[PDB]
Ligand binder design. Sequence first.
Ligand SMILES: O=c1[nH]c2cc(C(F)(F)F)c(N3CCOCC3)cc2n(CP(=O)(O)O)c1=O
Lengths: 50, 50, 49, 50
Amino acid sequence: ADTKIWNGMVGELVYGKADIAIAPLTITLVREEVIDFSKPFMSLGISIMI
Amino acid sequence: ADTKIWNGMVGELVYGKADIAIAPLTITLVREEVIDFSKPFMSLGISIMI
Amino acid sequence: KLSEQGVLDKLKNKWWYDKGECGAKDSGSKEKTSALSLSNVAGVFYILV
Amino acid sequence: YLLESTMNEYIEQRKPCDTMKVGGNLDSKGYGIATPKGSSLGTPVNLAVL
Ligand SMILES: O=c1[nH]c2cc(C(F)(F)F)c(N3CCOCC3)cc2n(CP(=O)(O)O)c1=O
């Protein structure tokens, strides 16, 4: 929030160090503005463990 | 297959009659080539009724 | 294309279940019954013998 | 009877309330909002859904 720079795999896509990211990367709104996401290959949610 | 003509809500978007389709339209491969889809707002699958 | 040919479903079954150590654990979750068994009334037979 | 899960949940909640759904979904698919190719609405609709 202070420096307005990305990190991680989203950072490497924006600043050019990589060309594609094949990883468990969640489709969110704030990530949608900077990079491009494909159609989802896996569906998930919150679950309960007992 | 014979006439190569789309019918329905998919047809109205291609030939120009309709501006947008808000409907339960399944994201498939064949429909992806002719028109554009957004991210899925609902997720479903095949289930069992007894 | 990979979604409609089931190749994503094929990879998910192999990595999650086929490399699973809890082998065929889903079969054990089925059985359920409620009645008296020998374990509840075993001491009465031991007094009888 | 094997059908889609969204209709399976709807018939369960209607009279005479005689049917139920068991198990989980067999496959995965989605419903998407459709626009014609090259339209100016495709980007604001996509950000609206997320
Ligand atoms: O895009 C994201 N995808 C993620 C995917 C996964 C996994 F499930 F492992 F794939 C996880 N984990 C869940 C359990 O703890 C270990 C890691 C975290 C993710 N996070 C971090 P969030 O902020 O907590 O969601 C993301 O941001």
